[PDB]
């Protein structure tokens, strides 16, 4: 069924499984369905079976939940099998330079060259398969890592479910979403690297026997300094994070109030504040980048001293042949590359794995929900002595409820005041602490909060059932669901998506009632099912099914409606969590009549990135000239020397390509500084552009994309991009310099090197398309798993009620396998790319070696040693090119976002009014006309409730609108929009408040006097409103000014508008937002101070607007005018 | 030391002479007003009155003698009366006169225009850190002065602390206070201020006052009690555990000293080891807290009450045969 199953041994070694996959991908666009079938051994159901069996065996075995000790029994044999070849290949690569310790004598070396060439093939064979094997082991383990906790998700106790952090599990899942899988490559490196040192030290003592630990101590000191720099780097990052979070909060606040900001014309102040805040974060980031650059450069710089100090003692003591010098150079290169890189990375990987193991082992051990032992056989259920806490506080006051088998029970009282908890306990969601509950157990419940998963009508109705024609028809016809179904487009198979927005809340309640009705059980724990429908609809549903069909069976509906409460078989009213009265319907109705009555990646993109800041070009020119001059000087030195012992020692300066071509400390810092400066310039440009964008395109994009436009993208640009770009540049320069040095050795090298580079470029280009397609597909597919997890989290209670968890497990496994298919495909393609690149490099090295062998001792040694080192640099270079390709996506997104178009007396006259949200959308006005009275308010009446916010926005032209607005003789065209809109006074339903002290929050422009501000605030009733604030006026508006009430915020907005001295002021929804006293104070203040303005108070209720003198009646597509109520009340309202 | 210890010695000396000659029945309820009830308080009734003969506004703490007998708190009332009649410290509002009627007893206290700081903290939520230290310094001063007399307050609630026209807090509610040297087995009061030693039902010494003041400072900065639970039994268990999470805004210097103040070890409690209050005085949280200069209370206050005359109740809330006369023989 799977193509990789139909693979030969040689095909498996070549990993050519994706060869037709690559053939299709480089030809045509990616198709998700075209993915090869998942491996049989890769089945989530299969692997999780063994994982769970081992976990259970261990959990029973001993008093220590050592999950690692169990998973060792699952994986250690394969881990050691891969590690054996891994360590063998490491040993081979380490020992290979010693074989070069023979050719230096120059006949016989031809066989040595053939063997050295074969060593590359052998090492590549040993290396390449191991990465794929260990990574397959990792992904296999990770699948069950998800699976065990996912199964436990249906096992947790609800009492801790309300306490367990919802985000903690999400963060736990996301943390190892990619880290733990890739974290296996360094696994056996512990078992190898110490052995690598053991071999290398023996090699050195073989060459020296007297200078061994001299360079080892320098290497250890370098490792110590490198580790020490990390603590300072982490401290700098931690310091930067808080200010970055504050800046993000301010930016999010601006994003939420974008329309109000455009109205207030505060873009400049917002930009100035954002830049001023970002200045300190930029300083911290520059310091952190300097530290990181020093740390990264230390590794490249170490190579010179690493050989120099090791050689200096032996060389001074006695003479040494340069052959051993080159050999020691290679040996030390290997020793350093392992000591400085392998050990710490492996230590970090193991520590992270151990911590994750501890966390996972702790998580699964939590106390689980105990299922009720029921469904055997029973008559009418009864309860006795119900008393327990929902978390002390007895949710039930010794309650008892003997429900007849077939009866229709009901209870009333305060909503969710423990009656819902009593229902949950009866359903088994809450363990009763007192008394004894007995029930048949087969019973459905209907939570007040509907949990609708995606799926068609049949899916929502079945939830693991067959298609019953009569039952489905009865459910539709009885739950008011037949008409709503007919209202659906397909009307039978409308596959619902995510969010449930396709249906109304009463539609969701009807869905819940139908879902409860779908299965027959001992009881139906209804909880206010009619809570979202009209009274007539509720009565119809009751008479049809709720009080007709299932009422013949035992039923318990949480209903407070008096009319149904009269017909109930028994009632149970509880107050303060305690049943005040209950019992038979007639008996309870007669025992207390008084209570009864009372209660009832383009090259153009890279060029634009380069062209952002001119300093980058100068820095690049300086670095390039420095590199070229250094290479030329090295070539001149080599030529002069090749055609007293200090001259021999100077050959070591050429011996290490890393130190010879190292980016000078006097050069690298300017590159990163320019990177940071260009990032800051880009941030400022993006902020300025976002301030001017037209609203029409702004509404088209979702607002959360505006947050994502800077939440991570700017961070990636600041941190990730500079380091990667600099490392790639330095590595490329070093490699190119090595190539030039080798070409200087003999006049044949370039003729072969050029085809190798060209083929490498072609191969990289071919691999890039498939790699990007696979990465995008895999990233896109990951979301559905979190979507299913969130759906399960939302529906947990209803799922526990249904008991059909197997289908949810099937869905989760299907999604996990779907993601795993793409992940394995991408990993395999990357492995094939790595193997092919290694093969190309090996071929080039072999050809160069043969050419040199056919061909002076120092030149041969230099060429061979440079060849002996270039491989790791080339691999890092390929990885860096891939990383740059990955990083360029954020820059492309930023460039696309910046590439946006900009937005572009009291008497007044409007005409030819055309408006819409988008270009050519719903016509908000049909050539509408209106006249503004001098100093008199116009009542926004007529079609109130059909939407007046659009007309209010059109008063400032904040929408896709065009027409005529001739106010005071001034037109809508001559004046700039920033100057034309200022005359209007905004009174939004939601007040926009900048988080900060009152002085800044009320005066963003900062062009007034403090005494005048205090005098106006006293005139605007804010002095007493501010006297209760911290200090006098410096009170920072934390949480968006959470201290201020809605009426206080309205007063603040009115005061700010009065300070702006606007000629107009359109009011909106005064009584809707204001409390009684707040509305009174607002009316008094407006009628006192703002008496001299041509206002427009928009009110849905005509009575609220009845005080207005003028009246502008609204109607669908025609905003009429009614000067006087003598005709307005008789024609517009009547 | 020097002058401060010389003053403490004089205060301790004069307190004994004051305690040995307590007054009784200083006045009758015939020269007061009934303008408004300032509140109830505990199990009594508080009302704002004006001196008919002089004019000075004065509070009157009414309480039923039947309530004292039935609540089994009569000796505590007598001890409170004597201690209030003998107290001498600037940090607290003094008691002026005593009334003893056949129906109830009243106690004359000065008019407190600033009201309770608990309501102000509810209005503002969280005080600034220097604002917290400003009150905490005088609190420590008054507590150590009580240590200079060897008495146990046995009462610490947010509403009991008033504020002066000068901005200094005003102390009241001397009911649970008693001058007992050593350990006492009595247990009562607010669970939020219940030390584990009192919760353990053992002999209690003055050491619990440091924990009470630490809880006061922590809650004043946080706005929420460090120990809180739905039921008092769970609250008692949480207090017995002696563990609570510091707020994100909590400073290291203040929180580290709060760790010593809230240390479950009563012997290791800050202010009880060796030096009395000297270790607290040298603490960096009091790095700028002039203990001696506060004796004049000349420091600029964090906030001043909006006083508009003694007769205004704006700071206050706007609300609305003797039983065993042989026991009340010295009132």
Author numbering:
A (entry chain A): 3 to 108, 118 to 402, 437 to 645, 844 to 886, 910 to 1121, 1125 to 1173, 1207 to 1436
B (entry chain K): 13 to 332, 341 to 351
Provide passages from the article that reported this PDB entry:
CFTR gating (opening and closure of the pore) is under tight control by its regulatory (R) domain, a mostly unstructured segment containing 10 consensus PKA-C phosphorylation sites.
The main reason that PKAII is less resolved than PKAI is due to the conformational dynamics of their respective binding sites. In contrast, PKAII binds between the two NBDs, which are inherently flexible, leading to the lower-resolution structures of the PKAII-containing complexes. As the two NBDs approach to form the closed dimer, the structure becomes incompatible with PKAII binding.
